[PDB]
Design a protein around this ligand. Structure first.
Ligand SMILES: C=CC(=O)OCCC(=O)O
Ligand SMILES: C=CC(=O)OCCC(=O)O
Ligand code: NI
Ligand code: NI
Lengths: 127, 131
C-alpha cells in the first residue's frame, strides 16, 4: 500500500530520455514500476522544445495528457486541434496521434498509461 | 459522433454546463468529471478535477484501484495512511490500490488537482471509509 509524492526536482539525477525519431522532445519517468514498484498507473513528464514534433503513432493502451505549459498542435488521426496549458487530452487505445510545439515557449505535459510501467507499452508508426 | 478511437480535449471551460459535485462528508471539496465513460464514452483511464477550499478536507478513505493526483494549484497536507506530508503545485502523487489516504487544505489558496483512475468511469470505483 505505497503512497509517494514526486516532482521534477525529485528526479534531477534521472537523465532526460530522448530519441532521434522525435526531434526536440525529451521526457522523464515519475511514476513507473521499473522505478518505484508502483502498479496500475504509470506517469511521465514530457517537454517539447519549440518546433519539436512527436510524430504520428499509436499504442494499444488508452492514454491521457495533462498539459502544464505552452501550446501545441494535436493531430487527432488527421484532424488538428490546438491544445495549451490547462487542457487534458484523452487518446483512445490504437488511435493515431501526433503533437507538435508551434509556440515559442516549451510545451510541457504529463502522460498517463493504465499500465504498471512505460517500458511495456509498444509504439507503432501510423500508416 | 465518437468512436472507439476517439481523441478529445477538455478543460474547465469545456464542462461549464456540468454542475460542480460536492458532499457534506468532504467539506470545502468540489469536483467535476473531465474524462469519463459516463460522460464521454472513453475507456481505460478516467479523470476528474477537484478543488479544495481553504480549510477543506477530503477525509480518510480507500478504494481498490490505484490512483494518481496531479497537483496544479495551491498547497495541501496529504495523509499517507497516518503520515502527513505536504503536496503542492507541480507534484504528482501515486496512491496504491486500497491505500488509506486523505487530503487537507491548510493554506490560503485553493488546492486544485486532477485525479486519474485506471477505470472507464468514476462510477465504478467503490469508496470505503477509513478502517
Ligand atoms: C517524451 C514523450 C514520450 O515518450 O511520449 C509520450 C506521449 C505519448 O505517448 O504520445
Ligand atoms: C469526492 C472526492 C473525490 O472525487 O476525490 C477523488 C480523489 C480520491 O479518490 O482520493
Ligand atoms: Ni502516445
Ligand atoms: Ni482516493
Amino acid at each position: 500500500h505505497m503512497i509517494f509524492v514526486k516532482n521534477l526536482a525529485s528526479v534531477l539525477s534521472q537523465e532526460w530520455s530522448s530519441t532521434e525519431k522525435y526531434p526536440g522532445v525529451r521526457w522523464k519517468f515519475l511514476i513507473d514500476a521499473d522505478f518505484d514498484g508502483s502498479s496500475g498507473l504509470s506517469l511521465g513528464f514530457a517537454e517539447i522544445a519549440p518546433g519539436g514534433d512527436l510524430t504520428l503513432h499509436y499504442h494499444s493502451p488508452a492514454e491521457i495528457y495533462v498539459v502544464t505549459n505552452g501550446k501545441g498542435i494535436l493531430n487527432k488521426s488527421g484532424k488538428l486541434e490546438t491544445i495549451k496549458k490547462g487542457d487534458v487530452v484523452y487518446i483512445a487505445g490504437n488511435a493515431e496521434h501526433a503533437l507538435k510545439n508551434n509556440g515559442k515557449e516549451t510545451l510541457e505535459f504529463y502522460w498517463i498509461f493504465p499500465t504498471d510501467r512505460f517500458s511495456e507499452v509498444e509504439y507503432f508508426p501510423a500508416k
